[PDB]
Every structure is written in structure tokens, then in C-alpha cells.
């Protein structure tokens, strides 16, 4: 009997030890879009040297002009509207904002801020229902008062920012609408393997898209959690591509590289380790997920799939 | 028709428009004093060149050894330990930790804290009952949260820190009598001269003392709200000394210099130009009034007299 199967390792930890903080500033606002803004239909690029791939190798790009998918970081709103300028002119679908961000987070006086705590943890271990109410008393317990905003910079510790009193309070939702996009959110935990209830959601939705609907995912960084929903939506629309094509291609257009690399953490990311090596194993878990239940049209959930065949360090 | 008189300049500013947001660490509790630490008994050091004084002037010390005050920044628990252990070197009578601190403040886990706002006005405007109920509730509601604390650095704005989860708080009126000294607020606002009702409060408290007091005086820096009550003392105590040798011994004994000097600020702080114009004709405005009333024994307090005899620019 085991406590904590392979693919929920974040389960051990204790949320009271991560809790809130700070309104962290999520993007200056300066560029013209988020960082790390990549599509589907984008070139493929030279591999990170760090991953140790081989940059001769040619990824198949077989289903990668109709997959129809985005990433980035998180953004400002006006930064939103001109991504979803960018990509209305790629299709004629609807085109949704998929926030996988389970920190609570939103807008300030049109400033994107999130509730920091330790490792991005602030949520950790809650529902989604418990994420997005402590997210909608936060952001409403904003407006009228004063508050803290800044940026993280010397070990992950508040460095200057601004003092304000809110005017106008907005949660990603309205900003997303107000871009022309349709909003999902999946509360991931930063930093970690999205969770069985994560996965769920997200194969629901999933299911019943449009044909033509795109889909921009992004998170804080844009890299992580983005790059884990973007792979798994590579998988499920085109499983007949192999598994070494679907993580170069993903990580050369931009995005993290989710196969076995030489994981090397500094010091004080030393607790970060465990969590990629989850990630790797799990991707692979996730890839025969697709592939033993594609022929029957997933009628066995993956919270359910997963339990009967765990997955091994 | 004058809407606020001198003195009083403080009152036309919006509290609003300062109000707390960050948990300031008020001493690293390196040191085994608080800074600026200095009694009445010390010797006098040559003037700071900013306030153009006379070097080769030398002060009268009439009154000084039987004066029995000191001054000095905030501090660690065991930092008024020491302080209260080296004032009892001094005296046989009681021992005052008299806190001048409007702000709201406290300690978390041994921790020297103030809730800061900009300017640290936090509690600008509210009456010392208001003040002290809110840092008690400020205080209390901290107790098994999570908090951060941080020193400010850049631009008075938070600058590194730490969080942690509060296991026990403390106010300063505690912290005071478990170091052996008796303990009376005093809530006048940081930068600025101290309201009728602050030193109303003073003189009636000093009227109480019993001949072998000992006044340790102290804010949060230890140098504006500190000396001013240092020089009130001086003056109560010792009327016969000159206005001059007054102010240059509180300053040459490592206090403010209040008398007249060529002020100079930087162009973030031009705000404080007029306060510390105010602060040099109200400190004459409260030598007349020693001096006036102190034959009769002060039969009328400050503020009524000051209303009847307006400082003026
Ligand atoms: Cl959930």
C-alpha cells in the first residue's frame, strides 16, 4: 500500500507551508505580447543545448497544420488582444483562452497579478471549486483598497513594484471576453505533473470542441504547465505520431522539451528534480494512455485508466 | 479664517492616500543596542555639518546629569533587555520605555514589525484609540498566518525579507514590561511635530512622575519624534538653560538638531521641506510656552495656549 502513486507526488507536500503571500506582477505590460507566444504553425528551431538532443534530427510535422494550438505566458490585456488578433488570422473557429493556472490570480486596475506564495503554492492542495472562490474573494476584497504589487527578484522575495488603491477589479475570464475569446480554466499546481482531476477536465472539454477550435494555453511562465497540455493535445489529435516527434516538435517551436534529459537543478531548486522526473515518466504514461484508448473513443476516464496502471519511477 | 494653523500642517493630508501595506522589519537585531542609542549623561560630540552649527560652541551641561532620559531607534526584545540592564546601571526609580510610534507595531515571533505605509502614515489621522485598536486587531489576526517581512530598501519599498507562520505575538507595551520597564504610548505621527494632544498627553503623564524617573524615549528611527520629546523633557526640567544650549546639547549628545539650519532634501523628499520648517518654530513656540507658564504651574495646558498665542511662518 502505497501513500502517494507516481504522477501525485505534490500530494505529500503541506499546503499550509506554501501559503500566500504577495500580489505578485505577473508581466510589465512592455512587449507587445507574452513571452514565450509560440503556435502550432510556427518553424521548428535548434534544440536547447541543455535537453542533449540531436540536432540533426528532422521531427515528422504530420498533423501540425490543423492542430491548431498556442502557448504562453501570462499577459496583460492588452497583450491578450493582440494575441488573439494574431491568431483570429489563422482561423475562423472559436478561439479559447485556456488558463491553467491554479494560483489565484487576475486584474488589478488592468494590472495581471497573482497571489504568491512560496513555489507558486499558494493553492496547493485545494479543489478547483476552493481555488476559484479564494481567487474571487481575493480579487473582490482588492477593489477600494490598498495594495502591494511586485515583481519576485532576489530568491523569489518581493523587489520594489508599487503601492496603489484599486479602482477596478478583473478576473482572466472577463479579460479573455473582453479579447474575443472563450475562457476554460484548469487549476494546475506550478512547477508539477497536472493532476488526475486536471487531466479529467481537460479530456472532457476536449471532446467536445468544435472541428476548427483553437486552442491558446498558457500559464505564468508559459513553459511548464503550458508545454504539458500543449504535448498531450499533440497526442490525443495525432496519435499516430511517435512519441520522439511529439516532444522535439513541441520543444522547437518553443516550448520545455518533456523527454529524458540531464536534469541539473542549482542548489536552492534542488526540490525541483523529483517533480521533473515525475514529469518525464508521466508524459510517457500519458502517450500510452492515448494509445490504449483511442480504438474505443476513451470511454475509461484517465483518473480511472491511470489507477489500474500506475506509473514506475 | 485659517484652515489648519502651523503646526497642525499634517492634518491636510489624506490618510488615504498612505495607508499600510507590508509588514516593515523594524530592527535586524544584529546589533546588541538599538541605533542612535544615547542618554542624558553622555558626552558631547562635535555637531553634524549638515546643520551649519558652531564647532567651537560649547553648550552649558546645567541640569544634564540629573536629566535622566535617553533615546533611541526601535529594537529586538533583547535589545531593551540591554537597554533597561544599562539604564538601571543609572537610576533606582522606574524606568520608562516611552514609545512615541503613531504606526502600528509589534512583535512577530520576536520580531520587531510595523505595519508601514507610504511615508509610514499608515495611521494618519486616527486618534490614538483608533491607532492602538488597530494594532491590536493587526496584531492578533497575525497569530498562525502567514506573513511577510521585509526591510525596505529601494525607494521605501520592500526589499527582500522573509515569510513565515506566525507562532506568537507581542506588543511593544509587553515586550517593555518583561524587560523590567514601565511602558506609556505616545502616538504621534512619523516626520512630523507632535499634535496639541500628543503633548498635552506628554506634560500630564510628566506631571506624574516621581523625581527618580528615568524617560527612554524612542520611534522607529530614533532621531525626529525622539529628540523632540527629548528637548520638551530638557526644557520642562532644566527652564533656566538657554534655548541654544538646549538644542545644541540634544543634538551633540546624538539627537536632531531643532533649531534653525539651511535645509536641504532630496527631490523624492521635498515633501518633508515644510515639516521640518514647522518643526523649528514650533519647537520656540513650546520653549515660550515653558517659559510662560511654568511660574504658575501650568495652570493651562499646550493646546489652549497655543490656540491663544498661534505659532507663525
Ligand atoms: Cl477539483
Redesign the pocket.
Known amino acids: 500500500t502505497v501513500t502517494e502513486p507516481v504522477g501525485s507526488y505534490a500530494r505529500a507536500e503541506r499546503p499550509q507551508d506554501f501559503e500566500g503571500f504577495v500580489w505578485r506582477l505577473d508581466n510589465d505590460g512592455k512587449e507587445a505580447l507574452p513571452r514565450n507566444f509560440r503556435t502550432s504553425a510556427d518553424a521548428l528551431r535548434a534544440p536547447e543545448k541543455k535537453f542533449h538532443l540531436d540536432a540533426a534530427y528532422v521531427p515528422s510535422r504530420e498533423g501540425m497544420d490543423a492542430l491548431h494550438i498556442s502557448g504562453s505566458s501570462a499577459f496583460t490585456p492588452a497583450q491578450l488582444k493582440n494575441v488573439a488578433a494574431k491568431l483570429r488570422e489563422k482561423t475562423a473557429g472559436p478561439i479559447y483562452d485556456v488558463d491553467l493556472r491554479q494560483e489565484s490570480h487576475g486584474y488589478l486596475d488592468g494590472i495581471p497579478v497573482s497571489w504568491y506564495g512560496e513555489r507558486d503554492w499558494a493553492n496547493l492542495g485545494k479543489?478547483?471549486?476552493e481555488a476559484l472562490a479564494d481567487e474571487r474573494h481575493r480579487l473582490h476584497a482588492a477593489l477600494h483598497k490598498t495594495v502591494y504589487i511586485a515583481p519576485l527578484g532576489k530568491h523569489k522575495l518581493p523587489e520594489g513594484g508599487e503601492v496603489r488603491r484599486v479602482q477596478k477589479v478583473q478576473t482572466e475570464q472577463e479579460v479573455a471576453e473582453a479579447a474575443g475569446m472563450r475562457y476554460f480554466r484548469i487549476?494546475a499546481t506550478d512547477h508539477v505533473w497536472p493532476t488526475p482531476?486536471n487531466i479529467d477536465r481537460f479530456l472532457a472539454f476536449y471532446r467536445t470542441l468544435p472541428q476548427d477550435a483553437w486552442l491558446h494555453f498558457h500559464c505564468e511562465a508559459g513553459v511548464g504547465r503550458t508545454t504539458a497540455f500543449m504535448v498531450m493535445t499533440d497526442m490525443l489529435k495525432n496519435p499516430s505520431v511517435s512519441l520522439k516527434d511529439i516532444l522535439y516538435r513541441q520543444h522547437e517551436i518553443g516550448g520545455f522539451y518533456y523527454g529524458e534529459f540531464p536534469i541539473k537543478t542549482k542548489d536552492k531548486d534542488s526540490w525541483k528534480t523529483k517533480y521533473y522526473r515525475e514529469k518525464i515518466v508521466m508524459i510517457e504514461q500519458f502517450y500510452r494512455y492515448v494509445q490504449e484508448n483511442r480504438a474505443d473513443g476513451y470511454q475509461t476516464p484517465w483518473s480511472v485508466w491511470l489507477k489500474s496502471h500506475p506509473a514506475k519511477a
Open positions: 479543489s478547483q471549486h487549476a482531476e
